[PDB]
Design an enzyme around this catalytic site. Sequence first.
Site, PDB file in Angstrom:
ATOM      1  N   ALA A   1       0.563  -1.157   0.033  1.00 43.63           N
ATOM      2  CA  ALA A   1      -0.081   0.004   0.214  1.00 43.63           C
ATOM      3  C   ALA A   1       0.761   1.255   0.022  1.00 43.63           C
ATOM      4  CB  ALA A   1      -1.006   0.158   1.182  1.00 43.63           C
TER       5      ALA A   1
ATOM      6  N   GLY B   1      -1.737  -4.814   6.534  1.00 43.44           N
ATOM      7  CA  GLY B   1      -0.428  -5.547   5.967  1.00 43.44           C
ATOM      8  C   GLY B   1       0.471  -5.947   7.068  1.00 43.44           C
ATOM      9  N   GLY B   2       0.965  -7.145   6.977  1.00 43.87           N
ATOM     10  CA  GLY B   2       2.043  -7.358   8.140  1.00 43.87           C
ATOM     11  C   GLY B   2       3.351  -6.450   7.829  1.00 43.87           C
TER      12      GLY B   2
ATOM     13  N   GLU C   1      -6.505  -8.372   9.833  1.00 42.63           N
ATOM     14  CA  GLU C   1      -6.208  -6.903   9.695  1.00 42.63           C
ATOM     15  C   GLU C   1      -6.643  -5.911  10.961  1.00 42.63           C
ATOM     16  OE1 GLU C   1      -6.762  -6.886   4.760  1.00 42.63           O
ATOM     17  OE2 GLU C   1      -6.309  -4.809   5.888  1.00 42.63           O
TER      18      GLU C   1
ATOM     19  N   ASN D   1     -10.074   2.937   3.345  1.00 43.78           N
ATOM     20  CA  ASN D   1     -10.154   2.613   2.040  1.00 43.78           C
ATOM     21  C   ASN D   1     -11.689   2.431   1.603  1.00 43.78           C
ATOM     22  OD1 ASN D   1      -7.667   2.001   0.719  1.00 43.78           O
ATOM     23  ND2 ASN D   1      -7.504   0.072   1.269  1.00 43.78           N
TER      24      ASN D   1
ATOM     25  N   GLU E   1       2.245  24.839  10.619  1.00 41.42           N
ATOM     26  CA  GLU E   1       1.625  25.984  11.165  1.00 41.42           C
ATOM     27  C   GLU E   1       0.089  25.462  11.467  1.00 41.42           C
ATOM     28  OE1 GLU E   1       2.351  30.168  10.167  1.00 41.42           O
ATOM     29  OE2 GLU E   1       0.334  30.428   9.915  1.00 41.42           O
TER      30      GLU E   1
HETATM   31  N1  LIG Z   1      -5.423   2.445  -0.960  1.00 39.57           N
HETATM   32  C1  LIG Z   1      -4.800   1.416  -1.187  1.00 39.57           C
HETATM   33  N2  LIG Z   1      -4.935   0.308  -0.034  1.00 39.57           N
HETATM   34  C2  LIG Z   1      -4.082  -0.753  -0.425  1.00 39.57           C
HETATM   35  C3  LIG Z   1      -3.082  -0.774  -1.590  1.00 39.57           C
HETATM   36  N3  LIG Z   1      -2.504  -2.077  -1.258  1.00 39.57           N
HETATM   37  C4  LIG Z   1      -2.803  -2.590  -0.316  1.00 39.57           C
HETATM   38  N4  LIG Z   1      -3.882  -2.063   0.294  1.00 39.57           N
HETATM   39  C5  LIG Z   1      -4.683  -2.307   1.571  1.00 39.57           C
HETATM   40  O1  LIG Z   1      -3.285  -2.625   2.542  1.00 39.57           O
HETATM   41  C6  LIG Z   1      -3.836  -3.759   3.418  1.00 39.57           C
HETATM   42  C7  LIG Z   1      -2.684  -5.034   3.339  1.00 39.57           C
HETATM   43  O2  LIG Z   1      -1.475  -4.507   3.346  1.00 39.57           O
HETATM   44  P1  LIG Z   1      -0.614  -4.557   2.304  1.00 39.57           P
HETATM   45  O3  LIG Z   1      -0.008  -2.973   2.003  1.00 39.57           O
HETATM   46  O4  LIG Z   1      -0.945  -4.862   1.072  1.00 39.57           O
HETATM   47  O5  LIG Z   1       0.542  -5.638   2.888  1.00 39.57           O
HETATM   48  P2  LIG Z   1       2.003  -5.320   3.236  1.00 39.57           P
HETATM   49  O6  LIG Z   1       2.365  -4.107   3.981  1.00 39.57           O
HETATM   50  O7  LIG Z   1       2.769  -5.480   1.865  1.00 39.57           O
HETATM   51  O8  LIG Z   1       2.322  -6.593   4.295  1.00 39.57           O
HETATM   52  P3  LIG Z   1       2.719  -7.931   3.919  1.00 39.57           P
HETATM   53  O9  LIG Z   1       2.323  -8.202   2.569  1.00 39.57           O
HETATM   54  O10 LIG Z   1       1.920  -8.807   4.780  1.00 39.57           O
HETATM   55  O11 LIG Z   1       4.195  -8.177   4.319  1.00 39.57           O
HETATM   56  C8  LIG Z   1      -5.493  -4.059   2.743  1.00 39.57           C
HETATM   57  O12 LIG Z   1      -6.050  -3.498   3.826  1.00 39.57           O
HETATM   58  C9  LIG Z   1      -5.311  -3.628   1.527  1.00 39.57           C
HETATM   59  O13 LIG Z   1      -6.717  -3.153   1.088  1.00 39.57           O
HETATM   60  C10 LIG Z   1      -3.185   0.167  -2.309  1.00 39.57           C
HETATM   61  O14 LIG Z   1      -2.412   0.184  -3.349  1.00 39.57           O
HETATM   62  N5  LIG Z   1      -3.816   1.442  -1.976  1.00 39.57           N
END
Ligand SMILES: Nc1nc2c(ncn2[C@@H]2O[C@H](COP(=O)(O)OP(=O)(O)OP(=O)(O)O)[C@@H](O)[C@H]2O)c(=O)[nH]1
Lengths: 440, 423, 59
Positions: free
Chosen positions: A12, A143-144, A183, A206, A254
């Site tokens: 993300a 995400g992790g 999550e 989201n 500010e």
């Molecule tokens: N707005 C937005 N949300 C995202 C995007 N990619 C993933 N997400 C959200 O992020 C969450 C999942 O985390 P990720 O960032 O994909 O996972 P990560 O940070 O790579 O962690 P791991 O893959 O477990 O190592 C979910 O709620 C997704 O909907 C993106 O490109 N845009």
Amino acid sequence: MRECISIHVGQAGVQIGNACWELYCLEHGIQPDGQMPSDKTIGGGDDSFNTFFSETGAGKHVPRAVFVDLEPTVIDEVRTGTYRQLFHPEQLITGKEDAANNYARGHYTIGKEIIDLVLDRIRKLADQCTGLQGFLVFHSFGGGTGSGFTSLLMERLSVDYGKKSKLEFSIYPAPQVSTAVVEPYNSILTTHTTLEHSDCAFMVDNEAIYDICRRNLDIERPTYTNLNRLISQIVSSITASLRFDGALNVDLTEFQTNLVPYPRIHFPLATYAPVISAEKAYHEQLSVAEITNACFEPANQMVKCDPRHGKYMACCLLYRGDVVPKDVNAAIATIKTKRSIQFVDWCPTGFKVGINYQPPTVVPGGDLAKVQRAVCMLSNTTAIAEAWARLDHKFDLMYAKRAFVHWYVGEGMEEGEFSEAREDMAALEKDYEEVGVDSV
Amino acid sequence: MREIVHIQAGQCGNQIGAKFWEVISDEHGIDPTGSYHGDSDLQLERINVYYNEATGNKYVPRAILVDLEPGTMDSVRSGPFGQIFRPDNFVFGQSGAGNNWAKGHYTEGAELVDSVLDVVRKESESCDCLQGFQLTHSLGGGTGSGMGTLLISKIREEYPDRIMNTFSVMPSPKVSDTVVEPYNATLSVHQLVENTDETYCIDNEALYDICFRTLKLTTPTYGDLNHLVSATMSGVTTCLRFPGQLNADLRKLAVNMVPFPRLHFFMPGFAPLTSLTVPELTQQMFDSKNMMAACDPRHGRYLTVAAIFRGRMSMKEVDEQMLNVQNKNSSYFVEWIPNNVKTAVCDIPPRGLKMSATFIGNSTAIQELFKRISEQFTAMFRRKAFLHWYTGEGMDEMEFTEAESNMNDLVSEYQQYQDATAD
Amino acid sequence: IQKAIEENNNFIKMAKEKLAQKMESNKENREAHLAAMLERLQEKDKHAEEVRKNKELKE
Ligand SMILES: Nc1nc2c(ncn2[C@@H]2O[C@H](COP(=O)(O)OP(=O)(O)OP(=O)(O)O)[C@@H](O)[C@H]2O)c(=O)[nH]1
Ligand SMILES: Nc1nc2c(ncn2[C@@H]2O[C@H](COP(=O)(O)OP(=O)(O)O)[C@@H](O)[C@H]2O)c(=O)[nH]1
Ligand SMILES: [Ca+2]
Ligand SMILES: [Mg+2]
Ligand SMILES: [Mg+2]
């Protein structure tokens, strides 16, 4: 001086980073190879856009950014994408195994193996700064890596850079595009660990972005690309005061003074307008009053919540484009006489206004219409605690049965960290209740 | 560059394993000689998950073929795609297991296990970042059931941080008169509960009923049953083999599907089953008649579900219909795991279908499967029938009782969380 | 100004120690998790030895 380093963590964070830096290059006239013909000072300079871009002797304008992910496939797209020449190879850092949506693996098992290299690369950027102002950290809650590695990084940044300011752009989970059942766990864990290390955090729900793309842009099934291009515009509005200058420009720090009354109460609610398609925008000019009124339509909020049922502790209006204070002041006067804008009794009620005259930009092939003027409102409202409540409730449902907890214990965590984190969230919800109560 | 190492043990394991590679090789455009002749780059983007790429641009399955008799593995080598497997990865003996779990687990299998580990080790060393292992085998036989669960334990000893996946074929009186199958199956489940992270339950009872009742096959053959296993195995691995967001690796799948470590036995499902719209794919996908395990999901509650849609279709319609099935069947999804149903979409459909749907359910109704085996187990163990086949190999009476108790406890755990409430 | 320096240094100090304790407590817990797993597996191997010996003596 006043340099700002951006750090994009996880899928993300990285993919949102791609959309932001693409948009920045278009706003400043920087080509995909980093060249900027309008920049007549080669190799350096003190222009406003140098807060986000460094300069090489060959005329390349390089983002002051680090991309980090524990697996390579997302950053690999950056390595081979359209802006691959924009970043030095060392700015794009990847591991081989991701955190498997497990905060424990991002913060401990897997994250600890790359944290030192990441800090080293951040240091390389900081050494190039003559007056580093702070960091911007883009990451997801769910995400992790976005949850676990971000918390580790934030903790380490407090050690290596003291109380130097760290701002977050945090992606709050939504079922429509979520990828893990746990999550809610990861969200509560990272919010608790980062709370004392973050000065200001902009949460992006989201589901709010999803609905906006469906309702306002008539996108049937929005993708991450749809969401991220909208998020970019909001991030751009927020950072525009740092990257451009003007007589009526107001620095983000500010606004920060007004947005953060207590250290823990540092989660502003952002609302952006106008979000309109090219078809509807045609022959329909949206005035200052119309986009300002839109800022108080909850459907345009970046986080789903009802400010009409909470209390305001600050209201900031960040305009960009063809906007003059006269029309702003007239619009604000109309809104106060017809909207439920109730402030807490210990805060002034005036709205703080900034205007950047550089007009908004859209990426080619996007869904957003190109408009002559836009606005992002940043308000500190007790209603944002609704987002915590929804998340804390899902946490309680699963944790009562210890569902999935074994995946975290197996990686070294203890149940005490879960309860400790949840209690900190309960106190945070309590803090937002207390600040809304009237003074005796 | 996240490699899976495939192992197939015994008669059943090698047959379903061979057809698994035939199907996915076609989906990825790999011919029996290992060369690529496909039309989409999406076929090669994650090819490294299941294939090594030997110089010359030929792709070799990261597969290991094990059996205590050469019979089944000789037909694999002389059949279709038999020449694609690495000849060094054939590890077989001559004694055989005689449909005896003890022979394959403790005696004959213990003699051959070391040579199999040498191959597992060699394959794993050349992995960029090994994910884990997937084992195809039956629980009713001797080699796949006995030596298969032994291999699991020995591999886990050397790769304790990696994921262990199994495609386990459950015995059924409708597809085997061999009478000691309840013993071999109960002894196997005893091991799987402890040493596997994810187990797909391929119930022969369900496969038979599908072929006979649904597909109108008076005399279902092992080939007919296996066409269902191949379509199922292809479906549940689509997320591992093609670019995607959901359950793209074995560990992320386990984190989404296993809320408690012992409850890792999934109910596969597939649609369509015909001897087609999105609403029909989803309705049939959740129907008991389409489950590869002989359990009615409306006799229990869903802890977790993974849905995989394949083919070109409306993602908006998929999301709508998946919300519709959950709302209209909310009683069958536990409240205390919110958002426990995740959905993936792959543009590439299987062979011969314009669009399909694969179902992976962790349902407490799976206890009906173990209850059926337990009833067949206690019926014979009460009579001490055929125990000399197992005590003669050195086993003790307690080990049977322990396996029985552990499987009965597994049933109780599913009932516990089925009766669990949020308030 | 000295109090501002002391508080900032104490914040850095306590953040460094808390993290060092978490990463140490986590390493020990995960290692103990894996130690129990292998000790159980090695008990199965020891049991497999008894089975093969219990048969050999039956002859
Ligand atoms: N707005 C937005 N949300 C995202 C995007 N990619 C993933 N997400 C959200 O992020 C969450 C999942 O985390 P990720 O960032 O994909 O996972 P990560 O940070 O790579 O962690 P791991 O893959 O477990 O190592 C979910 O709620 C997704 O909907 C993106 O490109 N845009
Ligand atoms: N679906 C399917 N099941 C099989 C096949 N071969 C054997 N089985 C099942 O496996 C059990 C016998 O085990 P088997 O694999 O033949 O013994 P092994 O050679 O020692 O592994 C019986 O209950 C059969 O129903 C097959 O090709 N397909
Ligand atoms: Ca310059
Ligand atoms: Mg990731
Ligand atoms: Mg047989």
